[PDB]
Design an enzyme around this catalytic site. Structure first.
Site, short mmCIF file in Angstrom:
data_model
loop_
_atom_site.label_atom_id
_atom_site.label_comp_id
_atom_site.label_asym_id
_atom_site.label_seq_id
_atom_site.Cartn_x
_atom_site.Cartn_y
_atom_site.Cartn_z
N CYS C 151 0.76 -1.22 -0.06
CA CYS C 151 -0.03 0.08 0.18
C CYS C 151 0.76 1.30 -0.22
O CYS C 151 0.52 2.05 -0.91
CB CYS C 151 -0.91 -0.17 1.24
SG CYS C 151 -0.08 -0.45 2.76
N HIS C 178 -0.07 5.33 9.61
CA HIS C 178 -0.94 4.12 9.14
C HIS C 178 -1.93 3.78 9.86
O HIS C 178 -1.62 3.60 11.03
CB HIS C 178 0.49 3.01 8.86
CG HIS C 178 -0.19 2.34 7.74
ND1 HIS C 178 -1.21 1.11 7.79
CD2 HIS C 178 0.27 1.92 6.49
CE1 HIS C 178 -1.34 0.30 6.72
NE2 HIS C 178 -0.36 0.75 6.00
N1 LIG Z 1 -4.62 -4.31 4.87
C1 LIG Z 1 -3.57 -3.67 4.19
O1 LIG Z 1 -3.46 -2.25 4.61
C2 LIG Z 1 -2.61 -3.98 3.35
C3 LIG Z 1 -2.45 -3.16 2.35
C4 LIG Z 1 -1.30 -3.81 1.25
C5 LIG Z 1 -1.09 -4.89 1.41
N2 LIG Z 1 -1.48 -5.78 2.36
C6 LIG Z 1 -0.61 -7.13 2.35
O2 LIG Z 1 -1.61 -7.96 2.17
C7 LIG Z 1 -1.42 -9.48 2.74
C8 LIG Z 1 -2.75 -9.97 3.46
O3 LIG Z 1 -3.07 -8.68 4.19
P1 LIG Z 1 -4.50 -8.47 4.84
O4 LIG Z 1 -4.50 -7.30 5.51
O5 LIG Z 1 -5.60 -8.80 4.26
O6 LIG Z 1 -4.46 -9.52 6.13
P2 LIG Z 1 -5.61 -10.59 6.66
O7 LIG Z 1 -5.11 -11.04 8.02
O8 LIG Z 1 -6.74 -9.81 6.91
O9 LIG Z 1 -5.57 -11.73 5.47
C9 LIG Z 1 -5.03 -12.86 5.53
C10 LIG Z 1 -5.96 -13.83 5.06
O10 LIG Z 1 -5.01 -14.97 4.44
C11 LIG Z 1 -5.79 -16.22 5.11
N3 LIG Z 1 -4.80 -17.52 5.03
C12 LIG Z 1 -3.80 -17.73 5.99
N4 LIG Z 1 -3.17 -18.64 5.82
C13 LIG Z 1 -3.68 -19.32 4.40
C14 LIG Z 1 -3.40 -20.36 3.66
N5 LIG Z 1 -2.33 -21.23 3.99
N6 LIG Z 1 -3.89 -20.56 2.65
C15 LIG Z 1 -5.01 -19.53 2.41
N7 LIG Z 1 -5.41 -18.45 2.96
C16 LIG Z 1 -4.55 -18.35 4.08
C17 LIG Z 1 -6.33 -16.01 6.49
O11 LIG Z 1 -7.38 -16.75 6.82
C18 LIG Z 1 -6.77 -14.35 6.14
O12 LIG Z 1 -8.24 -14.39 5.66
C19 LIG Z 1 -0.26 -9.31 3.57
O13 LIG Z 1 0.86 -9.46 2.83
C20 LIG Z 1 -0.29 -7.71 4.00
O14 LIG Z 1 1.05 -7.25 4.17
C21 LIG Z 1 -2.12 -5.31 3.26
#
Ligand SMILES: NC(=O)c1ccc[n+]([C@@H]2O[C@H](COP(=O)([O-])OP(=O)(O)OC[C@H]3O[C@@H](n4cnc5c(N)ncnc54)[C@H](O)[C@@H]3O)[C@@H](O)[C@H]2O)c1
Ligand SMILES: NC(=O)c1ccc[n+]([C@@H]2O[C@H](COP(=O)([O-])OP(=O)(O)OC[C@H]3O[C@@H](n4cnc5c(N)ncnc54)[C@H](O)[C@@H]3O)[C@@H](O)[C@H]2O)c1
Ligand SMILES: NC(=O)c1ccc[n+]([C@@H]2O[C@H](COP(=O)([O-])OP(=O)(O)OC[C@H]3O[C@@H](n4cnc5c(N)ncnc54)[C@H](O)[C@@H]3O)[C@@H](O)[C@H]2O)c1
Ligand SMILES: NC(=O)c1ccc[n+]([C@@H]2O[C@H](COP(=O)([O-])OP(=O)(O)OC[C@H]3O[C@@H](n4cnc5c(N)ncnc54)[C@H](O)[C@@H]3O)[C@@H](O)[C@H]2O)c1
Lengths: 337, 337, 337, 337
Positions: C151, C178
């Protein structure tokens, strides 16, 4: 009187902090597999609600030195493996949240613990004691594993006992407006267990209804009220302090003034230290660190008529509960083992 | 049907936003002395709860141009001075919070308004109408100044009407867990009026008990329930959406399932658009922008027995109320003047 | 162009919501082992930040039906086991947060995916593309597994590109204020991994410094700025929308007005849809659901002198990022496979 | 040494609380027209951040009795009318926020005050002293009305002095991530004065950019840095504790380790009690009630190169500032009158 803590979470750490204020019980060992000794020292010294630990914490080497006294530290997933007897721990405060049965919590006795206090309502028929309500019913010859009930049961049962003894509860329904807890999430996501789908919603910007068994639990602690109370919780974004809102039909007429005197009489006599009262314009933050189980708020209560009342009692769900668990461990020690 | 808004606050601005969705009422003039036309345009276009205004706002010159239509803007402290008749405003939404009597709100009729809707419960005996409860009792020959009651009365009275008509309310006590409002403060300080000393405590980290007259107000709106309800509020840090928690003894036995069907039958018939229902695992944020007065949450409710129930209904205190005030202004216009 | 989502979290679900707005990419399969189809339907339909899903969600039976179109659902821990090819998914949005290497994310190609987009900065040297910065450098013959960066990198790199091309960045230091994320906790407790001890502190009442690699990442995306930026984050309790605060020494003199025109020229030409600008008195909530990567806030910026400036750019870290990941998946599809 | 407080707000009340810890200054009179003696007693005894007053508060009758000592209470809008001399108050802490000029604050000397400390940066050229920076430049023969600067200037100027003396600041830009204040609103509404339109947006769910003159103020307090710093603030929803983020180009190379030793050397010598340091994984709540002006956070800082650094310093904007104002009142008393 010596105490071991299994699970160095919000309750495990504030149980430690409560004993360090206390001259008749000492924490001698901690077990938490999801933090090393250095991370344990950090989470003890710093608290986002309860402030900086009042005293010294250092790491001596796989042990803590807290106010100059050695606290042995373990990292065992299995309770059967924690050497409680070697460490000299007679009572175990079981505050993981994951060994809430007699079957699971009794494994601590293989480690050489004499007694176990579950820091939660049990999943089975482990007996629950609430201090100043039914703690003197405890029989050391009959039970080694006992429960201290929930934060909410410790708030509601002293108030329900005072009300029921003096006026009689016909029927009652509790709402607890409850501060947020470790079960909740910062952002919307799968709940652990996919069980309370609502608990998994962003904690900081939501009012979240919860089920609570606290009010039915008052029926075990006070058998006179079995089947006379049920209740629900509403989780709100505040970090600590919760409020019980008990709506009851009374068997005898009582004004809020008569109820306030009944509470005041018990707070100043048999429930000294457990039940408190206030007539001040108080708000939740005013009870952060309150050691009382239950603080009756006279000016927040409302009666529809002489027989049908809504009573408001505050409780520090973290700090008040932890003091009661230390109270019960001191009490259980005094009865033998 | 034309509408003037006195007081361009949370309710005044969302009343404007609700009319811009609506084809049978138009906002033609606004009065607020504590914001110029440019600041009015800003507070309309941007909202921390309700999102960016859906449409165009520009300043034409001491006037707004909202979706291309001219809205005259005034800055008058005194209601007698706002030229409502010149602007062509037939109904005035009085949403300052400081002209809640007939004496004060009737001064708007000197400006050439025909009817005044107070956006608050009145300090005097101005009649209160709640849409889908008692709005058809309104007599245009008897009253020019009427009240739309509170957000909470609009939540509770539809639910209380359904329950009372079908089962009968013997006695009831309401708690509202209420989102924070303009009366509250960001940090601890003197309340405006030194009246609710508790309302003046830091809003964002406290659970704050409040008095509310909402439940006694249901006794004016539904005279059958005069003296059968009282109630209290608890202010919590969430920015919007509130929840009514109605504990009632019923005259007839009713399961939560029977109550859920009674609600569902009224939501799909006579209270279409006012009363809603859900069986989903909902939390407060799920109703931001909900236009319903009251959303019955089946799975949050609990019964002690067939006769003594606690019912949970959500309401968007900002958005739901504002739609009802626009509904009542449309209704009042249809009855003449 | 078809899309599979691994990990139905904040980014996985908003990627789905973004595609449902979009006519040139369709989500055809989801994998998440920590939620069944019914819990997936719930977390899709309801969002505490982004509001109720705009459209229909139903469970057809181990499948979703979203706006009438079948989305196959899987519950596989291992990426090698998800039948992406059977489901007809060409690109996989890898948004678990736990397969951020080529080694781990390439296992999705065994399932019959053609391309993988990691929704995170990689732990290895997987190439990062940022849309409107370096996405046209992508070579489909050289890489099957690519990253969309963070992000913050998507906020900072468009702004850094505009500034560097027009004036030249000598040296720069970023702070990102953030919004809170799934890595944080509601109450003080052991961080997952005991790695960011600070991230484990109560999220709702703390300002929490964080490390971020976002600014060093701008040196991969823009090789001209390799070694010219570093940066840190501060996590704050708001539920969504973040702000980059870029302090840079410039090689050429530039007023904030000259920088504002440079941004405006790129927003209205080559970075249409990625870079935006505002001169309004905006606050974080005003960008909830903003699809831009980066919104330059003219009136929040400050220059010490013509050469040393602090620039403020907003970004919806949830919604803006998810649109960019869908943009990159559309772009990657257009280049072949 | 005796102290009168005009304005019993967040700073006025914590100045009182700080003196009650202190054996060489006593509060002898308070003036606040927007609270009676009983409401003053309440806002003193209870604090949503700082906890229950450590000691006794009672109302003796238009006077307070605080830890057994009489504090005269006044309710005067006009400073010329408060009988400071009659009450025996030598220094007036002027903490209303509305008498920040020499013209207005000098009217307190008609009441028989000898010296006035403004608890704010002045609107005119009243001299600002910061303790441990330039307080010894104070000339009692030249000034009766002086300012203690802002919370932020007291955080930044000790850190800037250490850095500039040891390495030299070429150019610097500050961001302060600042906890919310009484100027902010719980819900979106007209700012008082229609001046900071952004400050009027819902405080609890927004990141809000603010202008601050704190960094230009460091150029009055340290004339060597006149024109070398400017700065901006970002208001965030936390109730207390703020963080200064100072980006500077240095004239000499310095590692964060060399800067950390420079800070540590000054904290343990000439700025004992004003400047502090930490290497712990600290978060904002860890400094609630910290009496230091400025706590350097080693592990949050980042350097781009040996010459261009970002330094992070915490400050309790309420508690740290109030201790400094009491320090300056003690210092000003020691210099005569
Ligand atoms: N939310 C933000 O602001 C943001 C922005 C940009 C990037 N990201 C990145 O995106 C990624 C996910 O972020 P998020 O905020 O959605 O986190 P989150 O915890 O909300 O989502 C992760 C999801 O992955 C699932 N998961 C875990 N292990 C798994 C597996 N083995 N197989 C399939 N699904 C599995 C979990 O159940 C969960 O629903 C991270 O790498 C994070 O750094 C987040
Ligand atoms: N916080 C409250 O308001 C409150 C009040 C009363 C009772 N309780 C109850 O107390 C219990 C703990 O609550 P909490 O708020 O401290 O939760 P928490 O998540 O803060 O603490 C649980 C701790 O147990 C540890 N743990 C997990 N598995 C373990 C294992 N196998 N062995 C040892 N340690 C292990 C975790 O690492 C964590 O530190 C729960 O049963 C809860 O219902 C909580
Ligand atoms: N927000 C809610 O949840 C809610 C719901 C239902 C009813 N209400 C009621 O609606 C009323 C307004 O509530 P609000 O939340 O919008 O408050 P608010 O403070 O947001 O709005 C009041 C507005 O009135 C303006 N005003 C003050 N004096 C004025 C005058 N003399 N002439 C014209 N304008 C003047 C103020 O500048 C302000 O913009 C109150 O009576 C309140 O009880 C509020
Ligand atoms: N809170 C902070 O973080 C902080 C830190 C440093 C400096 N300051 C400064 O200190 C001053 C006060 O700040 P605060 O946070 O305590 O604000 P506040 O609103 O909490 O306090 C101001 C008080 O002054 C009273 N007052 C208003 N007019 C008065 C009058 N004519 N006579 C007497 N009393 C009157 C008000 O009733 C109120 O109690 C401002 O100048 C502010 O910039 C605040």
């Amino acid at each position: 009187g010596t105490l071991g803590i299994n699970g160095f979470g919000r309750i495990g750490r504030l149980v430690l902090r409560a004993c360090m204020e206390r001259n008749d019980i000492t924490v001698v060992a901690i077990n938490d597999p999801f933090m090393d000794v250095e991370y344990m020292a950090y989470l003890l010294k710093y608290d986002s609600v309860h402030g900086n630990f009042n005293g010294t914490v250092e790491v001596s080497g796989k042990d803590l030195c807290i106010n100059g006294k050695v606290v042995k530290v373990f990292q065992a997933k299995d309770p059967a493996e924690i050497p409680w007897g070697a460490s000299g721990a007679q009572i175990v405060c079981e505050s993981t949240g994951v060994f809430t049965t007699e079957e699971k919590a009794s494994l601590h006795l293989k480690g050489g613990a004499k007694k176990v206090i579950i820091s939660a309502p049990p999943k089975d028929n482990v007996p629950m004691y609430v201090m100043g309500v039914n703690n003197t019913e405890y029989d050391p010859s009959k039970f080694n594993v006992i429960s201290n009930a929930s934060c909410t049961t410790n708030c509601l049962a002293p108030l329900a006992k005072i009300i029921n003894d003096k006026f009689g509860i016909v029927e009652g329904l509790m709402t607890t407006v409850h501060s947020l807890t470790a079960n909740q999430l910062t952002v919307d996501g799968p709940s652990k267990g996919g069980k309370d789908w609502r608990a998994g919603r962003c904690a900081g910007n939501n009012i979240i209804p919860a089920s609570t068994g606290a009010a039915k639990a008052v029926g075990k602690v006070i058998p006179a009220l079995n089947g006379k109370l049920t209740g629900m919780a509403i989780r709100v974004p505040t970090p600590d302090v919760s409020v019980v809102d008990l709506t009851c039909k009374l068997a005898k007429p009582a004004s809020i003034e008569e109820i306030y005197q009944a509470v005041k009489e018990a707070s100043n006599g048999p429930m000294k230290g457990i039940m408190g009262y206030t007539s001040d314009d108080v708000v939740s933050t005013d009870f952060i660190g309150c050691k009382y189980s239950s603080i009756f708020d006279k000016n927040a209560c409302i009666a529809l008529n002489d027989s049908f009342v809504k009573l408001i009692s505050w409780y520090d769900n973290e700090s008040g509960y932890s003091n009661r668990l230390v109270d019960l461990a001191v009490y259980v020690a005094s009865r033998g083992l």
